[PDB]
Design an enzyme around this catalytic site. Structure first.
Site, PDB file in Angstrom:
ATOM      1  CG  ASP A  35      -1.675   1.224   1.258  1.00  0.00           C
ATOM      2  OD1 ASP A  35      -1.915   1.931   0.138  1.00  0.00           O
ATOM      3  OD2 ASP A  35      -2.627   1.404   2.653  1.00  0.00           O
ATOM      4  CB  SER A 199      -1.877  14.132 -13.437  1.00  0.00           C
ATOM      5  OG  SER A 199      -2.537  14.042 -14.801  1.00  0.00           O
TER       6      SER A 199
END
Length: 330
Positions: A35, A199
């Protein structure tokens, strides 16, 4: 040193991925959920409340000759999906794919929430976010990667998750045969303890690319792709009959649909998520309403590039002095 381990979807939907991890001496192999959105290595154990264990493999520290109680240490964690676990702490030898850390903090669960009990395939979590998020008190502990880093050939790990198929976590090296083209690297902020990056935009299907900054986290422990409501609405508007359902808890779409792809930007590069990756199947057994793999982050407080996004890429988690993230197509 290096390590390499195969990671395998837990079910036919890729709801999560498990990777075998050796703990203790002799080795006890547990299948852990790696994770990159948390920083605790915790396991079902011989200390876990018996009624909260249902099929998981447990770690038994009394059977490990290298286990030592970390005296006075406790831990307690809550995840974004509302699940939680807590307990005490041992140090022990932990190996992943041939890479060994001695003195790793292994957090032994005394209590786990129902979602964990109900998932027989996940024996615990192995956190790979920054150690500043680790919950051990009163002495915070380091992640497996943080402990291994100085010994690694290069201070990196990579995630190569499969679509409806196994994939690989590598530690200490970049497998240049595992991706196509080049890896594009992008800046990371560690201020919130995550692999947080920005992004450069998105496209839906064959549509034009929209240049827009989207801050979010690379999180292998989250199943879906969570993005701003504007972006998500633009995606689902291209699917006839798709709608946001308050009762179901997100966007659903007719199971008869053919889903468009979703592209996200990494600098000037582009990662394409095929439409099929966005299908999470019937909302309930036999339903013709299917659950979407792109959902709104509104009310999460952060955008999350979870497995839906990451499995479309070869992803480098670069833990150099100034960390960065790399993405390649594959």
């Amino acid at each position: 040193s290096t390590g390499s381990a195969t990671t395998t979807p837990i079910d036919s939907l890729d709801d999560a991925y498990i990777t075998p991890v050796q703990i203790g001496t002799p080795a006890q192999t547990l299948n852990l959920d790696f994770d990159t959105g948390s920083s605790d290595l915790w396991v079902f154990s011989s200390e876990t409340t018996a009624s909260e264990v249902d099929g998981q493999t447990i770690y038994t520290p009394s059977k490990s000759t290298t286990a030592k109680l970390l005296s006075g240490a406790t831990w307690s964690i809550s995840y974004g999906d509302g699940s939680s676990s807590s307990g005490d702490v041992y140090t022990d030898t932990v190996s992943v794919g041939g890479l060994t850390v001695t003195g790793q903090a292994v957090e032994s669960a005394k209590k786990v929430s129902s979602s964990f009990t109900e998932d027989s395939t996940i024996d615990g979590l192995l956190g790979l976010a920054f150690s500043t998020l680790n919950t051990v008190s009163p002495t915070q502990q380091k992640t497996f990667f943080d402990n291994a880093k100085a010994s690694l050939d290069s201070p990196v790990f990579t995630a190569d998750l499969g679509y409806h198929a196994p994939g690989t976590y590598n530690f200490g090296f970049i497998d240049t045969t595992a991706y196509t083209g080049s890896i594009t690297y992008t800046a990371v902020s560690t201020k919130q303890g995550f692999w947080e990056w920005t992004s450069t935009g998105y496209a839906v299907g064959s549509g034009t690319f929209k240049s827009t900054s989207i801050d979010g986290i690379a999180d292998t422990g989250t199943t879906l792709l969570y993005l701003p409501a504007t972006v998500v609405s633009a995606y689902w508007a291209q699917v006839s009959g798709a709608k946001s359902s308050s009762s179901v808890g997100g966007y659903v779409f007719p199971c008869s649909a053919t889903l468009p792809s979703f592209t996200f930007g990494v600098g000037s590069a582009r990662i394409v998520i095929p439409g099929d990756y966005i299908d999470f199947g019937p909302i309930s057994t036999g339903s013709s309403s299917c659950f979407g793999g792109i959902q709104s982050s509104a009310g999460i407080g952060i955008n999350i590039f979870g497995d839906v996004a990451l499995k479309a890429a070869f992803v480098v988690f670069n833990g150099a002095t100034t960390p960065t993230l790399g993405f390649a197509s594959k």
